[PDB]
């Protein structure tokens, strides 16, 4: 055949892959964590969005730390040979490097490690996408008026917020980040490479949202998501 190029992930396997959505809304009383009003709007929007991208969506609700770890372990031990990719969405409370099960924290590194190139061989060389709506600390953004591959290769962590910062969720509309992500996937998944879609999500969150609070400490604040890419190829949700 003629000249060939290899700059994008193969996304024409028989299946696009799994999309696991972990939706933690209600937390055990002893943890003192508040209920996350609006997160069901997010989970529903994500399910529809990834359905239209032809992912096999599995929604999970109110998982303990033990259940999260068991779920990730079990999914990583499935045969993904006929799947192009893997997507995991985490909706919960969090801190830097941490997302909360309903009864306590789980290390993000522990979750991701199940899918390492050496530990999940049917996903080696395939994109593994982790989308995270959770806080990364307690900072607020005041804004300004205008042979081998690495075992950690082929991961992308699409974070809702910058390292060290809170992440914002609206109790009626859902989270700023997930709202924006779904809108941009709906509009551009048949048009743009995934990093460029996520850049549009960055712009949407950065420009169109600002917090409203009766508490001066929390009022008029801003948010910028953070793309953490260890991908080695361009990712298009469409093929041919």
């Amino acid at each position: 055949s003629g000249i060939s190029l290899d700059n994008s992930y193969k996304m024409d396997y028989p299946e696009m892959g799994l999309c696991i959505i972990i939706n933690n809304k209600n937390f055990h009383k002893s943890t003192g964590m508040t209920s996350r009003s609006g997160t069901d709007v997010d989970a529903a929007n994500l399910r529809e969005t990834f359905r239209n991208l032809k992912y096999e969506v599995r929604n999970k609700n109110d998982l303990t730390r033990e259940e999260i770890v068991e779920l990730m372990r079990d999914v990583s031990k499935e045969d993904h040979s006929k799947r192009s990719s893997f997507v995991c969405v985490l909706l919960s409370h969090g801190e830097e490097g941490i997302i909360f099960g309903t009864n306590g924290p789980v290390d993000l590194k522990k979750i991701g490690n199940f899918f390492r190139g050496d530990r999940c061989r049917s996903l080696t060389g395939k994109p593994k996408l982790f989308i995270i709506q959770a806080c990364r600390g307690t900072e607020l953004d005041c804004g300004i008026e205008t042979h081998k591959i690495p075992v950690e290769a082929d991961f992308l962590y699409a974070y809702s917020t910058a390292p060290g910062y809170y992440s914002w969720r609206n109790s009626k509309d859902g989270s700023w980040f997930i709202q924006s992500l779904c809108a941009m996937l709906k509009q551009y998944a048949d048009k743009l490479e995934f990093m460029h879609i996520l850049t549009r999500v960055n712009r949407k969150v950065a420009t169109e949202f600002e917090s409203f609070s009766f508490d001066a400490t929390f009022h008029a604040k801003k948010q910028i998501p953070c793309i953490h890419s260890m991908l080695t190829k361009e990712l298009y949700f469409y093929h041919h």
């Binding site: 508040t34 996350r36 009003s37 609006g38 919960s92 409370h93 969090g94 709506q133 959770a134 806080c135 809702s160 809170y166 992440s167 914002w168 969720r169 609206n170 109790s171 989270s175 917090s211 409203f212 609070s213 929390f218």
Partner: peptide, 4 residues
């Protein structure tokens, strides 16, 4: 608006 609430924080996570």
């Amino acid at each position: 608006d609430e924080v996570d």
